[PDB]
């Protein structure tokens, strides 16, 4: 099965936000569904639960009357309306395709991160990372992209819009002493196709939609 969640952004305390997990791969409307979260302290917490679409919906005493879980048996999508948000609602929320008749917490996802801070959502500053020229190892090469001074997390970086899936590592972000992050991704590409292929850095910041493409060229400069 496959369940992908969306709804990344920044909210202020007392605000609202809707999360959605599009469940695919197997039969929907037959299994129960729930929402689970993991705080930045890596503490698991149960949030909500729905019974195949349900007359039965129950939330945690922390999130009763502030959240509401919904299900769409037609679109195969499960929604989670977060309302009257607090600072303590900051976590990566997971959508679980679990059925308590045989399994308790079987399927989890890659998560979606929502932050409730009240701070200003700022935009990243993308700078190109120039490839290595000399003192080679007979090896490929290393070029990348620098996503500097963004908040909040996360940012997703692809290469050639899904055409460069082999030899790329996206490194985690650093919480610098400014309340902002900084991420770096570097690909490994042979120097033979280094002056023939155009390599594009595609950064897409979901909270504040900054879909920027960045070209990394040898600049004939030192």
């Amino acid at each position: 099965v496959k369940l992908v969640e969306s709804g990344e952004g920044l909210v202020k305390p007392g605000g609202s936000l809707k999360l959605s997990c599009a469940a695919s791969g197997f039969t929907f409307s037959s299994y129960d569904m729930s929402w689970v979260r993991q705080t930045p302290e890596k503490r698991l917490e149960w949030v909500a639960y729905i019974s195949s679409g349900g007359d039965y919906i129950y939330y945690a005493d922390t999130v009763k009357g502030r959240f509401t879980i919904s299900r769409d048996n037609a679109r195969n999508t499960l929604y989670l309306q977060m309302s009257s948000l607090k600072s303590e609602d900051t976590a990566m929320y997971y959508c679980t395709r679990v059925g308590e008749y045989d399994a308790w917490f079987a399927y989890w996802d890659q998560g979606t991160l929502v932050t409730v801070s009240g701070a200003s959502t700022k935009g990243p500053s993308v700078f190109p990372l120039a490839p290595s020229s000399k003192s080679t190892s007979g090896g490929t090469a290393a070029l990348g992209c620098l996503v500097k001074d963004y908040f909040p997390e996360p940012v997703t970086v692809s290469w050639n819009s899904g055409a460069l899936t082999s030899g790329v590592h996206t490194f985690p972000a650093v919480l610098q002493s400014s309340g902002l992050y900084s991420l770096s991704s570097v690909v490994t590409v042979p120097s033979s196709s280094l002056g023939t292929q155009t390599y594009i850095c595609n950064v897409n910041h979901k909270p504040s939609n900054t879909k920027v493409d960045k070209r990394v060229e040898p600049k004939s400069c030192d």
């Binding site: 890596k42 149960w46 945690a60 308790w104 917490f105 985690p172 650093v174 900084s182």
Partner: protein
Amino acid sequence: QAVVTQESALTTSPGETVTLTCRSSTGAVTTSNYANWVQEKPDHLFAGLIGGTKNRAPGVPARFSGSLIGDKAALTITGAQTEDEAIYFCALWYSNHWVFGGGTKLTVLGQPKGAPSVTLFPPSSEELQANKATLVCLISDFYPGAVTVAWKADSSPVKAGVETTTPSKQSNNKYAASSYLSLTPEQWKSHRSYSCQVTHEGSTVEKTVAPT
């Protein structure tokens, strides 16, 4: 109440028998608590392993035996392996809620080679024109994830403008880390070269870039 407590970090070797606990604060963990066991793999892969305090998923080997030891639960792994190194959570059922533990980080002795490969990048021409300078030292494909970062500029120790992240697991169960040196465009062009020193279990890897 509903406070679930367990161990924070354990370690074992392939072939040995492990046992994880799940203690309850309001009293004894009864069979009516339906102890759950999740498996936190890298890239946030929380796979559910055991439910009902003994019922096991169809894809989990028979080495995972769920039981109720003493006044708490148990996760016995008879025949531990390298693929069992992960964070394992417990979830006890109380008549109205679903509470979780803190997680027991299981360490396993294996993965023969964890030597890191280091990559260093100077600031970009666009960044230098923007009155900013930030060098990037990327450490990847190493195990375990315990390294010390050191930057050097013209044979002198550098400890200002350096923020560095704790290594996290990659997709191949190896660790990776990143170190950044924030400077001013004047300091970058005034020195001969900058070096990022990485040491991991005796072997020291340091790479140097120059403004040419």
